[PDB]
Amino acid sequence: ERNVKGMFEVLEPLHAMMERGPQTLKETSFNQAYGRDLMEAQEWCRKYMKSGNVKDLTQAWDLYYHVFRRISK
Amino acid sequence: SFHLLRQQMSLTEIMNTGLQEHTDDNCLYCVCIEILGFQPSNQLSMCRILLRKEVLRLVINLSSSVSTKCHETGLLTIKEKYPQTFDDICLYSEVSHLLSHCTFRLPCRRFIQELFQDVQFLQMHEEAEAVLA
Ligand SMILES: [Zn+2]
C-alpha cells in the first residue's frame, strides 16, 4: 500500500514497549540478541521521518528483514 | 517523485538530469574539468535521462534485500535491451557513491559492480591523453 505512516503506527508501540527495559530472562535474552539492530533500524526510521528520502528507509527495512528472518527460523 | 509514479505506470509505456546528488565533486569525471582543464561531457544519444533514474531506483530498491531477484531481472533486462546506458561515467559515479553510503549485501554489491565491468569509458581516457601531452 506504500503507507509509511501506517507501518510507523504498526511498529512504534513495539519500540515503545522495548524501551522500558526487559523484566524477565526471556526478554533480556531477546534484548541481548536483537536489540542493537532494533535500535539502529529505529534510528534510520527517525532519520527518514525527519528528512524524507528512501535512502534512509531502505537500510532500516534491511535491518528489519534481517531481524524477521532470524526470528522466523 | 519518480518512485511514486513508477508504481502505477510501467517501463514500456513511459517511453512513448536523472541523478539526485550529482555535483562537480564526488564524480569520477566532473572533478577534473576545473582542476585539469578536462573537456565537458558529451551529449549522449530525455530518451536516456529516464533510464538513468530507472536504473538508479532499481539499485536503491536492491539495497533493502527484500526481493532482490526481481530487481536482478529488471536490471539485466535494462542491460540486455540498452547496453549503452551503462557507459556514462557520471552514472557509475553516483551508483558507487550510493554503494558508499548504504547497506548492500555482498552478492548484491558484486552484481552491481559486475554490471559496470564491460565498459569502455573512451572520452575520459582520451581527455587524459589530451591533457597528458
Ligand atoms: Zn559527473
Swiss-Prot record, chain A:
Please give the organism. Answer: Homo sapiens (Human)
Q: In which tissues is it expressed?
A: Expressed in numerous tissues, with highest levels in testis.
Report the gene name: MTOR
Give residues for the crosslink Glycyl lysine isopeptide (Lys-Gly) (interchain with G-Cter in ubiquitin): K26
- Where does the record place a coiled coil? none
Indicate where this protein resides in the cell: Lysosome membrane; Endoplasmic reticulum membrane; Golgi apparatus membrane; Cell membrane
Phylogenetic classification of the source organism: Eukaryota, Metazoa, Chordata, Craniata, Vertebrata
Q: How is it modified after translation?
A: Autophosphorylates when part of mTORC1 or mTORC2. Phosphorylation in the kinase domain modulates the interactions of MTOR with RPTOR and AKT1S1/PRAS40 and leads to increased intrinsic mTORC1 kinase activity.
Could you say which protein family the record assigns here? Answer: Belongs to the PI3/PI4-kinase family.
The task this protein performs is described as: Serine/threonine protein kinase which is a central regulator of cellular metabolism, growth and survival in response to hormones, growth factors, nutrients, energy and stress signals. MTOR directly or indirectly regulates the phosphorylation of at least 800 proteins. Functions as part of 2 structurally and functionally distinct signaling complexes mTORC1 and mTORC2 (mTOR complex 1 and 2).
| Disease in which the protein is involved | Smith-Kingsmore syndrome: An autosomal dominant syndrome characterized by intellectual disability, macrocephaly, seizures, umbilical hernia, and facial dysmorphic features. Focal cortical dysplasia 2: A form of focal cortical dysplasia, a malformation of cortical development that results in medically refractory epilepsy in the pediatric population and in adults. FCORD2 is a severe form, with onset usually in childhood, characterized by disrupted cortical lamination and specific cytological abnormalities. It is classified in 2 subtypes: type IIA characterized by dysmorphic neurons and lack of balloon cells; type IIB with dysmorphic neurons and balloon cells.
Domain-related comment:
The kinase domain (PI3K/PI4K) is intrinsically active but has a highly restricted catalytic center. The FAT domain forms three discontinuous subdomains of alpha-helical TPR repeats plus a single subdomain of HEAT repeats. The four domains pack sequentially to form a C-shaped a-solenoid that clamps onto the kinase domain.
**Self-association and partners:** Part of the mechanistic target of rapamycin complex 1 (mTORC1) which contains MTOR, MLST8 and RPTOR. The mTORC1 complex is a 1 Md obligate dimer of two stoichiometric heterotetramers with overall dimensions of 290 A x 210 A x 135 A. It has a rhomboid shape and a central cavity, the dimeric interfaces are formed by interlocking interactions between the two MTOR and the two RPTOR subunits.
Q: Which residues of the full protein are shown?
A: 2041 to 2113 of 2549
* The protein's name in its UniProt record: Serine/threonine-protein kinase mTOR
Swiss-Prot record, chain B:
Q: Where in the cell is it found?
A: Cell membrane; Endoplasmic reticulum membrane; Lysosome membrane
Query: What post-translational events are described?
Result: Phosphorylated by MTOR; when part of mTORC2.
Q: Which positions in this protein are listed as binding Zn(2+)? A: H22, C27, C30, C90
Family assignment? Belongs to the RICTOR family.
Subunit-structure text? Component of the mechanistic target of rapamycin complex 2 (mTORC2), consisting in two heterotretramers composed of MTOR, MLST8, RICTOR and MAPKAP1/SIN1. The mTORC2 core complex associates with PRR5/PROTOR1 and/or PRR5L/PROTOR2. Contrary to mTORC1, mTORC2 does not bind to and is not sensitive to FKBP12-rapamycin. Binds directly to MTOR and PRR5 within the TORC2 complex; interaction with MTOR is enhanced by deubiquitination of RICTOR by USP9X. Interaction with MAPKAP1 is not enhanced by RICTOR deubiquitination by USP9X. Interacts with CCDC28B. Interacts with NBN. Interacts with SIK3.
Function recorded in the entry: Component of the mechanistic target of rapamycin complex 2 (mTORC2), which transduces signals from growth factors to pathways involved in proliferation, cytoskeletal organization, lipogenesis and anabolic output. In response to growth factors, mTORC2 phosphorylates and activates AGC protein kinase family members, including AKT (AKT1, AKT2 and AKT3), PKC (PRKCA, PRKCB and PRKCE) and SGK1. In contrast to mTORC1, mTORC2 is nutrient-insensitive. Within the mTORC2 complex, RICTOR probably acts as a molecular adapter. RICTOR is responsible for the FKBP12-rapamycin-insensitivity of mTORC2.
Name of this chain's protein: Rapamycin-insensitive companion of mTOR
User: What organism is recorded for this protein?
Assistant: Homo sapiens (Human)
Residues of the whole record sequence present: 1479 to 1694 of 1708
